[PDB]
Write a protein that binds this DNA or RNA. Structure first.
Ligand code: TTP
Ligand code: CA
Ligand code: CA
Ligand code: CA
Ligand code: CA
Ligand code: CA
Ligand code: CA
Ligand code: CA
Ligand code: CA
Ligand code: CA
Length: 901
DNA sequence: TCGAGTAAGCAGTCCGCG
DNA sequence: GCGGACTGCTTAT
């Protein structure tokens, strides 16, 4: 096989590399790598190396990496550019793997671990590591085994061995319900002292050294705790055995308020799953506890136990160990679904970076572009310091707040990357500038043509047209990958809807789910078989279809993120190719594109309707336009349609056969106006929305910018079995809104859009009447909590203290002394509840850590003093009032003359 | 919240507005 | 009571 790296590090003048050799075996080597850098040279000197602007360079080969680093410093002292890849390990990878890397994931050791630490006196701080590590579960992907290290004897209690027999039994048998599919994969090792546990763990680690190391909060807790505990018991040298090269660094992570330490393990790639999840899941969760995320992702029940976790080992060591094992498995289950490890490997090997650098799109793109340029013997520029400066972004149209009955939307494929490609925007393609007119003049095609030679953006920038820039070339490659995966995602989505339709008429029989590839649209034969399957088989297929859709979503949405982040990197001062001229060229072109096509669509529809100055485009934000289709429907007349699906078909056909060609003509003209390199503004129909035929539903509404709701029947060619609410920006979509209130507001919206005013009124009246019965957690607001100390003045709120911070201060006063009280953690999220006048907490609200029950001794008081009236007004009535005023509806029935009878 | 970007919404504080 | 100046937070794209 072709060789591929696992990890790479620079340690002084050596590159240390772990890799898979041509026979599929893991190897390690130390290489005295001699890096090269570059300086500009005269024309007279013959060279094969040129910088991205075509200026000749001479290659400097250094005796070692330290000499090269020192040369860079001396060049700074002289005031001359030192060109080339200054991150020498990336140059090493480029030289050693000068081909498209094909990797075999089955040869990569992926380790997933979790530790337990009993701590009677609060949270066990990893920097101190003052308490025994009393359990480690470490899953190894090559062995496919869970290795469980269990401490039986501790200063906090001696316990009996964990029983795999009890672990496997149902909870109704007094067991722990460790899933049957992993029971045979557990290798259980009890220890009568912590020193032998840790020594054995290190020997195990030496034999099965992780390449990818993951888990939940492993970077912020487990890794520093293990390292520091081992360091405390044995000394530094023993702790450094967690690194295969025996090198570690305490790394200080900081943001704007406060800093924290992590431990860099040289020769390991740590991908903490909480951080993978935050970057790649496109959620914003009220809590990031593993129990909360597991429930959300997997629909598994919370791991229940009596008493605090600090007393679980002594009271129920059996459950303690079983829950440690289950926690490790839950991360594996989340990854089986979301596939973020697969994503990280894919993108890491594509860019030729340390796999952990997938968290940094700047590093990822730096490597991709470097490797691309190096293939042509071109030399990358030196990175430079820039002051942070603002620059303009997207245009957002101010909508007229209203109900909107029939709506069709249109959206550009990968807009900003497509602009980069169309205009040919790159560091080395800048051709000059032209005299800019107001944007309005370009939008209305009255400004003089910018250039008859170069490709232009309405910010004044001109670009070469003779050859693609490196940014366009490389963004296109990742875009094409994205397009492939989006195809699989949408097919799986369409397939899911076929199965949902089939579930209306399930067959009474015993059978199996069909063995099919859900990434491809079901054939006629598969569809006929589906119509004869049982509900059980259909539901199994639906689950599999949905999992395939999720896999496609991960692959496509994060490649979209990567290419959009290349645009973003152009506006980040740490990017080697930072240039606000190019960042602004993209955003300003984007503004024009939106408003240009708004004009073109209005013009087209006014023509086919025989009107003048009528506004068909009701809204647009950044890219998409939303078009009112009322007049189109009315042109034929609602009575002509047999059912909802008939007018959806009609609008689908109208959009595709009439509107899209007009939009295409419109953008082709804009391309010629700007003299762009290639027409790539492909705006296709997105949503078709409206009320069910014959209903009193309103279809949709806008309250303002970034705030709307639509009842959608078809989305990008997926025809839903049941209509789907597309709600953007409204409180239903905000993690700060209480769970039960999201649910209620969503149902109010559903009733508004699908059923009408009377239906809304019936539901509102009931919610208002019954909501005090809702569980306190489900009606609590959520907020991130920053700068708690800044507003703490002797335990009381300082000037301008935020409401949620005031709540935390109230909580802190209430738990003074209470030893079984969780502390609110700076920068994490809290639940927040209002409190009625005269409550014993002495303030108008209280807050506590999100994802948790509030501690027992104040819970009864919070429940007794909760201000349901304020809660309802702020979280439910106020937002609903906004929805209904915008939609011109009443959520309460107003008096009429009929009341007199 | 270490990790690409800007636009813009709403909650809440403080305090003016005769 | 509502709105502007401001901080804080969270969303749309
Ligand atoms: C979602 C998102 C968009 N944008 C910008 C760049 C996008 O091209 C532009 C429009 O956003 P979108 O329409 O959400 O996405 P897209 O056009 O890139 O891809 P597609 O519609 O094919 O799924 O807004 C960002 O800069 N960052 C982001 O995270
Ligand atoms: Ca635990
Ligand atoms: Ca120490
Ligand atoms: Ca788009
Ligand atoms: Ca599309
Ligand atoms: Ca059937
Ligand atoms: Ca969009
Ligand atoms: Ca099209
Ligand atoms: Ca889309
Ligand atoms: Ca009490």
């Amino acid at each position: 096989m072709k060789e591929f790296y696992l990890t790479v590090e620079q340690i002084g003048d050596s590159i240390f590399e772990r890799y898979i050799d041509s026979n599929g075996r893991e190897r390690t080597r130390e290489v005295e790598y001699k890096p090269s850098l570059f300086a500009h040279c005269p024309e007279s000197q013959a060279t094969k190396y040129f910088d991205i602007y075509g200026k000749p360079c001479t290659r400097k080969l250094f005796a070692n990496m330290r000499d090269a680093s020192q040369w860079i410093k001396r060049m700074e002292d002289i005031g001359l550019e030192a060109l080339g890849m200054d991150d020498f390990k990336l140059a090493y990878l480029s030289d050693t793997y000068n081909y498209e890397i094909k990797y075999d994931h089955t040869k990569i050791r992926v380790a997933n671990f979790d530790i337990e630490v009993t701590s009677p006196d609060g949270f066990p701080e990893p920097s101190q590591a003052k308490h025994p590590i009393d359990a480690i579960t470490h899953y190894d992907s090559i062995d496919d085994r869970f290795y469980v290290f269990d401490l039986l004897n501790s200063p906090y209690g001696n316990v009996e061995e964990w029983s795999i027999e009890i672990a496997a039994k149902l909870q109704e048998q007094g067991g722990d319900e460790v899933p049957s599919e992993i029971i045979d994969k557990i290798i259980y090792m009890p220890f009568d002292n912590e020193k032998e546990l840790l020594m054995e763990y290190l020997n195990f680690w030496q034999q099965k050294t992780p390449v990818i190391l993951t888990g939940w909060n492993v970077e912020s807790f487990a890794i520093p705790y293990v390292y520091n505990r081992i360091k405390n018991i044995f000394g530094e040298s023993t702790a450094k055995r967690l690194s295969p090269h025996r090198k570690t660094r305490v790394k200080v992570i900081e943001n704007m308020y406060g800093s924290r330490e992590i431990i860099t393990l040289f020769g390991i790639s740590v991908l903490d799953y909480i951080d993978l999840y935050k970057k790649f899941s496109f959620t914003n969760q009220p809590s990031y506890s593993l129990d909360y995320i597991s429930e959300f992702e997997l629909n598994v029940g919370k791991l229940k136990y009596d008493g605090p976790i600090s007393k679980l080992r002594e009271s129920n060591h059996q459950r303690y160990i079983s829950y440690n094992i289950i926690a490790v498995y839950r991360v594996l289950q989340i990854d089986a679904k979301r596939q973020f490890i697969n994503l990280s490997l894919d993108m890491g090997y594509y860019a030729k970076i340390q796999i952990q650098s997938v968290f940094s799109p700047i590093k990822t793109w730096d490597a991709i572009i470097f490797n691309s340029l190096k293939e042509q013997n071109k030399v990358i520029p030196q990175g430079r310091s820039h002051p942070v400066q603002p620059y303009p972004g997207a245009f957002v149209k101010e909508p007229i707040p209203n109900r909107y009955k029939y709506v069709m939307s249109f959206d550009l494929t990968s807009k900003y990357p497509s602009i980069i490609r169309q205009v040919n925007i790159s560091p080395e393609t800048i051709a000059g500038t032209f005299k800019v007119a107001p944007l309005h003049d370009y939008i209305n095609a009255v400004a003089e043509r910018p250039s008859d030679v170069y490709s232009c953006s309405p910010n004044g920038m001109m670009y070469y047209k003779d050859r693609d820039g490196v940014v366009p070339t490389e963004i296109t490659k990742v875009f094409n990958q994205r397009k492939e995966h989006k195809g699989y995602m949408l097919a799986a989505q369409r397939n899911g809807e076929i199965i949902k339709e089939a579930l209306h008429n399930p067959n009474l029989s015993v059978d199996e789910p069909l063995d099919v590839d859900y990434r491809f649209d079901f054939s006629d034969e598969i569809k006929e078989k589906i119509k004869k399957l049982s509900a059980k088989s259909l539901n199994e297929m639906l689950f599999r279809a949905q999992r395939t859709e999720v896999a496609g979503m991960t692959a496509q949405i994060n490649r979209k993120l990567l290419i959009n982040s290349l645009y973003g990197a152009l506006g980040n001062v740490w990017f080697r190719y930072y240039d606000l001229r190019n960042a602004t060229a993209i955003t300003t072109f984007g503004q024009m594109a939106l408003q240009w096509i708004e004009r073109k669509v209005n013009e087209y529809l006014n023509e086919v309707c025989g009107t003048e100055g009528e506004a068909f485009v009701l809204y647009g934000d950044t890219d998409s336009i939303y078009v009112s289709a009322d007049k189109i429907i009315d042109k034929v007349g609602e009575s002509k349609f047999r059912d909802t699906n008939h007018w959806v078909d009609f609008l689908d056909k109208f959009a595709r056969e009439r509107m899209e060609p007009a939009i295409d003509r419109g953008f082709r003209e804009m391309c010629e106006y700007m003299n762009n390199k290639q027409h790539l503004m492909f705006m296709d129909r997105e949503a078709i929305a409206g009320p069910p035929l014959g209903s009193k539903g309103i279809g949709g509404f806008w309250t303002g910018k970034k705030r709307y709701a639509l009842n959608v029947w078809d989305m990008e060619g997926t025809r839903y079995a049941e209509p789907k609410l597309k709600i953007m920006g409204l409180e239903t979509q905000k993690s700060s809104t209480p769970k039960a209130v999201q649910k209620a507001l969503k149902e109010c919206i559903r009733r508004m859009l699908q059923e009408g005013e009377e239906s809304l009124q019936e539901y509102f009246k009931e919610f208002e009447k019954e909501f005090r019965q809702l569980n306190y957690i489900s009606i609590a607001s959520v907020s991130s909590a920053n700068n708690i100390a800044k507003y703490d003045v002797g335990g009381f709120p300082g000037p301008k203290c935020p409401f949620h911070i005031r709540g935390i201060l109230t909580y802190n006063r209430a738990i003074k002394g209470n030893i079984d009280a969780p502390q609110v953690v700076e920068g994490e999220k809290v639940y927040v509840l209002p409190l009625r006048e005269g409550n014993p907490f002495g303030d108008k609200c209280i807050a506590w850590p999100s994802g948790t029950e509030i501690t027992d001794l104040i819970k009864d008081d919070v429940l007794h003093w909760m201000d349901y009236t304020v809660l309802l007004e702020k979280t439910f009535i106020k937002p609903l009032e906004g929805f209904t005023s915008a939609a011109k509806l009443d959520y309460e029935k107003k008096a009429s003359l009929f009341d007199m009878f």
